[PDB]
Amino acid sequence: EDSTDFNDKILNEPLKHSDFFNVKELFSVRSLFDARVHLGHKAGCRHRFMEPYIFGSRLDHDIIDLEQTATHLQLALNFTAHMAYRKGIILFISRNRQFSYLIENMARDCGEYAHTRYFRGGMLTNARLLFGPTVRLPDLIIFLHTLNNIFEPHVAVRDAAKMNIPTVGIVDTNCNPCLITYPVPGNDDSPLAVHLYCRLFQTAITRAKEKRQQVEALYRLQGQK
Amino acid sequence: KNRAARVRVSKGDKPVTYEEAHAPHYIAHRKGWLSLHTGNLDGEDHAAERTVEDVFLRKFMWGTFPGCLADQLVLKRRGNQLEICAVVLRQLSPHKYYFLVGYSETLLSYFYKCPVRLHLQTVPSKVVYKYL
Amino acid sequence: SFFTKLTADELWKGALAETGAGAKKGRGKRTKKKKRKDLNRGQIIGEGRYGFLWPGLNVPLMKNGAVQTIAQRSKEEQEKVEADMIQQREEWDRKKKMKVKRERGWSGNSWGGISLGPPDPGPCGETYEDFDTRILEVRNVFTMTAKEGRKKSIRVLVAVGNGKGAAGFSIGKATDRMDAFRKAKNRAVHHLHYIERYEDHTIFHDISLRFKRTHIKMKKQPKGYGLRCHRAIITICRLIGIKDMYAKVSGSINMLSLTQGLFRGLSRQETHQQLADKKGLHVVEIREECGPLPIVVASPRGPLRKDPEPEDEVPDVKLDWEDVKTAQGMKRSVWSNLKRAAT
Amino acid sequence: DEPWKYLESEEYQERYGSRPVWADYRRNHKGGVPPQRTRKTCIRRNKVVGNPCPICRDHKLHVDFRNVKLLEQFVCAHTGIIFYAPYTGVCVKQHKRLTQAIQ
RNA sequence: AUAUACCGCCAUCUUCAGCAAACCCUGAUGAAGGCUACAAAGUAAGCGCAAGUACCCACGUAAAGACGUUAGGUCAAGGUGUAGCCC
Ligand SMILES: [Mg+2]
Ligand SMILES: [Mg+2]
Ligand SMILES: [Zn+2]
């Protein structure tokens, strides 16, 4: 009898509301513009699959349409908040050595996990052998940088697609958003933009966890009486 | 290639006990001797007789407990005593084990003219130190 | 000499010659060969030629509430006991010799079509008793290595399917055939496609695709038509759960190319519901057996279009010469429509 | 006397089950294309050939017009036609008997 | 009689560092391939090296030295398959 009401009133309650966690408050187009999110690489480095998200080139410098970025970021933050609310494992991945410390620190602070080092072969496709069969794979992977240091797509994207793990991702003008479940077109090299992404994701995850705790406490209190 | 008393790895599945796993160069390093008697010490005598007795005891005990032995014997000698310590699987009913213990003790005592004790430690199965 | 005797294990190791260069190479033919036997299969402790009955070892220690004494069986009963032991050993050997046959594949000496049972269960409550495994080809690939020269290995292509639209295939390379089977099926169970089936018995529409150099032309067929397809396609369709279908394979008949092209074509097919959603129109089925009654098999879930689809008098499609020749009856063939076993 | 009772018996359910009597039969022949006509008869002067047909390999299967349960297995449930002999592997004699019984 | 049936004990490369399973990935799921440390698909275990130990140290010398190569040596250490001998 406990499950029949617990499952509904906790798990399925946020799924009815469009924005349960009010992630739209966190960011604004003005804020993204101030964080230099719209900047992209030169037209030569452009990846064709990123053409729909490119507003236009400013003197052979692609500008990322922040109108589309706002909607994509809304979807991605809402998805991340819902996954955190369901206590799913969230793994940040970014091989960019500049932000490795910041990303690891943010992941540790928000209670989620980070992998900013050399992604060993089969860390996901061979996780059962590398960790023991009882290991629990991440339920959501967030790429703050979808390219490795040789500018090829991160192998973790393909591996997560193989293991059916949804991927939130910051795709730049030269990135490949084909297999990323929730692409977020935006600048991934500017320190301001990366800091903005880290703040937004940390805030969404923390809000989701706090809301989960509050809802669990309220449901347990009301069920007793 | 050295072949003495070594268990060569074949597939990674064959189980071996602690003694079978260790090679001869590990004797007195990681595994003790299976027979303890003052014969081989400095100045002592009758080493050959003790060695023959030990070989016969091992053969007799292996042939007297068919498949019961789970490991090599340990032949301790204190004075004229002779303790045979063995590790045996829990296959036979204890009646047969007790019958064999009494039999072997009496027969060996009358055959070697020394009080022979037989101490059995039972194990559910052959202890596996590793797989080769 | 007693001290010169050895143990049973050492004697078997020496006599059987299980190891050594002869086993590795096999230059010396061993049709006249020895096999291992358990000398202690039925031996009872306390039984011997003299036929003695030792209380507590081979006869009950207490009989009628009293301890038995050392007794020796008579010569007649001891002879009977020895004969009974011999007969029991013979019966054990006879039971060992007997066995049960299996079902051959496509041909009596081909691995194709032979079932391998369900894939091995997963680590944590992940079992696949619903799945069946079938071999599509086994090949002895010989690789030239620097030291050993020609080295034999087995490459096996298997397909696994539960019969309910979920199926996949995989390749397995090994040194032993059974290891290849295990690898291939345990990997194929992770690469499962989902083949949408019309009415759970056939494909949704006619398919014609070329993979590399292999052309596969599959035709949707009504119930009871059976599987008239290449034997590999028959096996894969049974694994998927397709009962009625036609299929002609042209070009190279490479088994792997054929298999993965078949899976590609089956996976990429479009359902009636998808078609209705795409074009926003009712998908109306017309059956000759049902007369002019229009049967709606799929309706768009969104808005329904009001403008009728343009009715071109001449459709612009690429027909097949084989299909046209068959329809016109000029496709004379002494091999087409030959009566064949049930599929 | 009552051929239909066998198909309701537990022995029939054990040997066959829900599948038709010819589900497990497989003709022995050379080549991938079988001969376009099955053997003339499995029973030759009261002797049985090596691989008897589904009907001949089970003496309790009586091809009688009242045994409609058995006859339904040799008629396509979707099209209503009678399977040709190579489809089920039945011999020509038993196939003719099945056709007459079905009619 | 057969080391060209073997066990047992060894030689040789070895004054080697690799080997073999179990997976994972790439090549469109072709034979095949799988390395970059400011790292780019390889890997948790096993064997060997290594480590540990013996001798006088942490050095050195011993010991160890996998898999595999030479149908290497031994049927005359012993055991044993097959074959042969039994005035
Ligand atoms: Mg960038
Ligand atoms: Mg044959
Ligand atoms: Zn017949």
Side-chain angles (χ1 to χ4, degrees):
Chain A
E1 303 194 328
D2 168 38
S3 186
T4 55
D5 202 26
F6 169 91
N7 298 151
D8 177 23
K9 281 187 176 158
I10 285 172
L11 304 166
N12 291 318
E13 182 63 33
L15 298 170
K16 310 161 196 164
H17 306 260
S18 62
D19 195 350
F20 190 72
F21 310 91
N22 195 239
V23 298
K24 64 182 69 176
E25 177 200 341
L26 309 187
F27 67 96
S28 69
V29 174
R30 158 62 60 183
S31 65
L32 299 151
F33 200 100
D34 295 353
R36 310 182 214 157
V37 172
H38 58 277
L39 311 179
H41 300 259
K42 278 174 77 178
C45 307
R46 178 194 304 136
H47 189 285
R48 94 178 298 197
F49 286 165
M50 283 292 298
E51 286 162 6
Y53 312 125
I54 286 158
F55 182 40
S57 68
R58 174 57 172 188
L59 285 147
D60 288 349
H61 278 64
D62 293 341
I63 301 309
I64 305 173
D65 180 16
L66 290 186
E67 301 281 1
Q68 295 193 78
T69 294
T71 69
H72 285 73
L73 185 46
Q74 168 75 13
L75 289 175
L77 277 172
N78 172 59
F79 189 92
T80 307
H82 280 299
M83 291 310 296
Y85 170 88
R86 300 159 83 94
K87 304 184 182 182
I89 298 165
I90 294 165
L91 182 67
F92 305 88
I93 293 177
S94 176
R95 289 287 301 124
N96 197 333
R97 289 200 302 121
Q98 168 164 0
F99 308 103
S100 165
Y101 181 83
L102 158 68
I103 293 162
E104 289 186 347
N105 192 359
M106 172 266 291
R108 183 193 61 207
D109 296 4
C110 69
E112 297 300 327
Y113 305 152
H115 190 288
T116 72
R117 318 293 178 153
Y118 174 65
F119 202 94
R120 290 217 288 168
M123 291 311 291
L124 289 162
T125 71
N126 214 19
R128 278 180 163 164
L129 198 80
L130 278 149
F131 293 131
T134 51
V135 67
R136 178 180 162 183
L137 282 170
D139 301 307
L140 168 69
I141 300 170
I142 307 178
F143 294 84
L144 292 156
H145 296 79
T146 63
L147 298 180
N148 54 15
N149 300 311
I150 60 156
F151 300 89
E152 289 298 324
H154 199 314
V155 70
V157 176
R158 187 205 69 201
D159 293 359
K162 273 193 185 287
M163 311 310 291
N164 310 311
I165 302 165
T167 57
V168 171
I170 308 305
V171 297
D172 203 359
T173 55
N174 64 335
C175 303
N176 190 2
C178 72
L179 277 166
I180 285 154
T181 304
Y182 285 93
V184 180
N187 184 357
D188 67 339
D189 309 277
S190 301
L192 282 189
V194 173
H195 282 81
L196 174 64
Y197 301 140
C198 284
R199 269 210 321 280
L200 292 181
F201 283 128
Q202 203 188 45
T203 294
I205 286 166
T206 299
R207 271 181 176 198
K209 286 180 171 185
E210 290 178 348
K211 194 82 170 172
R212 170 60 171 257
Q213 297 295 338
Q214 297 154 25
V215 170
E216 273 183 2
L218 164 63
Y219 169 81
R220 289 293 165 207
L221 175 61
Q222 183 160 12
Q224 283 178 338
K225 306 175 182 185
Chain B
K1 284 187 286 186
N2 313 295
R3 306 272 299 197
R6 296 147 168 83
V7 182
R8 315 205 88 79
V9 63
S10 303
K11 211 172 182 183
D13 52 353
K14 172 177 179 163
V16 294
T17 74
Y18 189 86
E19 314 320 302
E20 299 165 334
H22 275 76
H25 61 278
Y26 287 130
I27 293 155
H29 291 243
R30 296 177 193 171
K31 55 178 283 195
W33 301 273
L34 287 162
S35 66
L36 294 178
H37 68 94
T38 64
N40 286 336
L41 283 157
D42 187 1
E44 301 280 293
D45 293 328
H46 308 313
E49 274 61 34
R50 300 303 95 80
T51 295
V52 170
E53 289 162 14
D54 280 3
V55 170
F56 167 75
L57 285 161
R58 278 168 204 289
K59 287 195 68 54
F60 170 96
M61 278 290 292
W62 190 270
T64 301
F65 294 74
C68 298
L69 277 176
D71 207 349
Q72 304 285 357
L73 315 171
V74 176
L75 311 186
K76 308 159 161 277
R77 289 196 178 77
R78 282 196 311 289
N80 69 340
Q81 305 194 45
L82 175 52
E83 300 193 283
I84 301 169
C85 314
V87 183
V88 290
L89 305 167
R90 297 165 182 175
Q91 297 151 336
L92 307 182
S93 61
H95 298 79
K96 301 179 175 184
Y97 264 121
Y98 270 102
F99 178 98
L100 287 163
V101 167
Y103 181 76
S104 62
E105 283 166 331
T106 301
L107 198 72
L108 293 172
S109 291
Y110 273 71
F111 182 79
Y112 277 140
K113 315 302 184 194
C114 51
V116 172
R117 262 194 294 183
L118 173 58
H119 310 278
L120 298 192
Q121 185 195 141
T122 70
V123 288
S125 75
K126 197 146 188 172
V127 177
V128 180
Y129 175 58
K130 75 206 294 191
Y131 294 97
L132 302 176
Chain C
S1 179
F2 174 60
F3 292 97
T4 58
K5 301 160 183 260
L6 300 176
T7 65
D9 276 325
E10 300 169 313
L11 290 157
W12 284 127
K13 203 179 191 180
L16 296 170
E18 300 279 338
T19 65
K24 288 177 163 177
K25 300 177 182 179
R27 279 186 180 182
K29 47 194 174 193
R30 212 179 192 198
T31 310
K32 173 180 172 178
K33 55 193 165 195
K34 186 65 66 67
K35 208 56 177 165
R36 185 182 166 91
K37 195 175 189 170
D38 185 6
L39 303 167
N40 311 330
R41 180 265 180 192
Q43 295 213 48
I44 297 90
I45 305 169
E47 297 298 328
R49 271 171 58 172
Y50 293 167
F52 264 92
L53 310 177
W54 310 115
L57 195 61
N58 64 333
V59 289
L61 181 65
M62 290 146 282
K63 181 176 183 181
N64 301 6
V67 176
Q68 281 207 88
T69 60
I70 291 168
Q72 189 181 356
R73 282 190 294 243
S74 82
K75 191 162 177 62
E76 283 63 32
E77 66 201 333
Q78 170 63 15
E79 167 67 26
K80 171 178 178 180
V81 162
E82 289 185 33
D84 177 36
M85 286 173 76
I86 290 153
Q87 288 141 18
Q88 192 168 110
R89 190 180 69 182
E90 290 180 337
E91 178 207 338
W92 162 266
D93 301 343
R94 181 170 295 126
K95 286 184 167 174
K96 195 172 181 183
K97 286 179 176 185
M98 299 307 293
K99 46 177 71 195
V100 171
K101 295 186 175 180
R102 286 196 174 91
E103 298 309 318
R104 66 173 176 263
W106 301 326
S107 66
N109 202 65
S110 173
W111 280 99
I114 290 183
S115 169
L116 292 176
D120 303 338
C124 64
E126 181 176 312
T127 74
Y128 295 103
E129 289 77 13
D130 197 21
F131 283 75
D132 178 24
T133 306
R134 295 272 176 163
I135 302 160
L136 301 181
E137 68 176 358
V138 174
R139 180 165 281 176
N140 304 335
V141 287
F142 295 96
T143 309
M144 297 299 279
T145 58
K147 298 184 180 182
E148 317 90 303
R150 200 167 291 112
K151 297 195 84 165
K152 184 173 181 171
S153 177
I154 317 296
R155 179 189 103 182
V156 172
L157 173 62
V158 307
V160 302
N162 61 356
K164 289 186 280 296
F169 75 103
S170 188
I171 311 159
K173 292 207 170 203
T175 306
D176 184 11
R177 207 174 282 96
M178 309 314 300
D179 299 323
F181 292 163
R182 182 195 70 253
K183 287 184 180 184
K185 74 182 168 173
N186 292 343
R187 182 166 189 281
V189 76
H190 293 317
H191 292 43
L192 292 174
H193 300 84
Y194 180 78
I195 310 306
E196 292 277 1
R197 297 163 295 143
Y198 169 81
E199 284 193 344
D200 303 338
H201 84 93
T202 188
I203 60 187
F204 268 99
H205 56 66
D206 285 0
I207 291 155
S208 172
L209 74 164
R210 188 198 78 253
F211 185 83
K212 292 186 175 186
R213 284 287 105 204
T214 306
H215 301 83
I216 309 165
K217 315 208 178 81
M218 302 180 279
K219 295 189 192 172
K220 174 186 193 284
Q221 297 297 337
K223 269 174 184 147
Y225 186 85
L227 288 167
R228 299 184 55 195
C229 319
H230 182 279
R231 52 196 199 182
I233 301 184
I234 289 178
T235 305
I236 297 162
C237 282
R238 273 180 192 141
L239 289 172
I240 292 161
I242 281 167
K243 285 96 170 176
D244 307 279
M245 199 183 82
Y246 174 75
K248 175 76 188 94
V249 184
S250 299
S252 299
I253 319 289
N254 175 281
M255 200 63 63
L256 175 54
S257 301
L258 157 73
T259 287
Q260 69 182 317
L262 170 74
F263 269 111
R264 188 175 297 211
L266 292 173
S267 59
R268 278 181 191 158
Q269 80 187 284
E270 179 185 77
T271 81
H272 295 327
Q273 184 56 49
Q274 294 181 341
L275 173 59
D277 283 307
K278 167 173 77 185
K279 284 183 184 285
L281 300 169
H282 290 295
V283 182
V284 171
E285 179 179 278
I286 314 300
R287 281 169 175 283
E288 299 187 24
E289 55 264 21
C290 304
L293 174 66
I295 299 166
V296 188
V297 295
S299 293
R301 298 172 173 187
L304 182 61
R305 267 177 53 202
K306 303 284 196 174
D307 50 298
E309 194 82 349
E311 289 201 346
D312 191 333
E313 314 94 10
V314 189
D316 183 17
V317 290
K318 297 210 175 197
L319 311 180
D320 185 359
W321 173 233
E322 312 173 9
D323 303 346
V324 168
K325 193 148 53 161
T326 308
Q328 299 175 181
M330 309 142 64
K331 188 67 177 180
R332 315 176 202 93
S333 177
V334 308
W335 303 101
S336 295
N337 299 327
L338 281 179
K339 298 159 200 163
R340 291 181 193 239
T343 49
Chain D
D1 297 333
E2 300 155 348
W4 57 91
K5 288 204 176 181
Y6 173 59
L7 278 80
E8 315 180 334
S9 76
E10 302 159 271
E11 172 195 20
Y12 169 93
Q13 191 77 1
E14 284 180 321
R15 185 177 267 147
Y16 309 100
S18 60
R19 312 177 77 195
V21 302
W22 47 266
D24 53 357
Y25 186 69
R26 173 162 181 177
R27 293 176 63 197
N28 308 328
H29 58 68
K30 61 171 171 171
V33 186
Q36 291 304 273
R37 52 183 186 183
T38 43
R39 56 166 70 103
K40 209 153 176 180
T41 177
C42 296
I43 314 297
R44 200 163 278 272
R45 278 165 187 158
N46 295 293
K47 310 153 74 174
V48 176
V49 292
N51 179 23
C53 78
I55 294 304
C56 287
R57 74 184 172 171
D58 194 343
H59 64 89
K60 304 186 175 173
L61 282 170
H62 299 303
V63 182
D64 183 24
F65 77 96
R66 303 167 297 170
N67 197 356
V68 294
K69 289 301 185 181
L70 182 62
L71 308 181
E72 276 174 328
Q73 308 172 25
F74 299 85
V75 169
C76 179
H78 323 273
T79 74
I81 69 167
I82 304 173
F83 299 138
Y84 41 79
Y87 187 87
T88 45
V90 295
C91 48
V92 170
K93 185 172 177 86
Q94 295 302 331
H95 181 243
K96 284 179 185 184
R97 287 182 73 232
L98 276 157
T99 300
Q100 283 177 348
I102 285 157
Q103 191 47 48

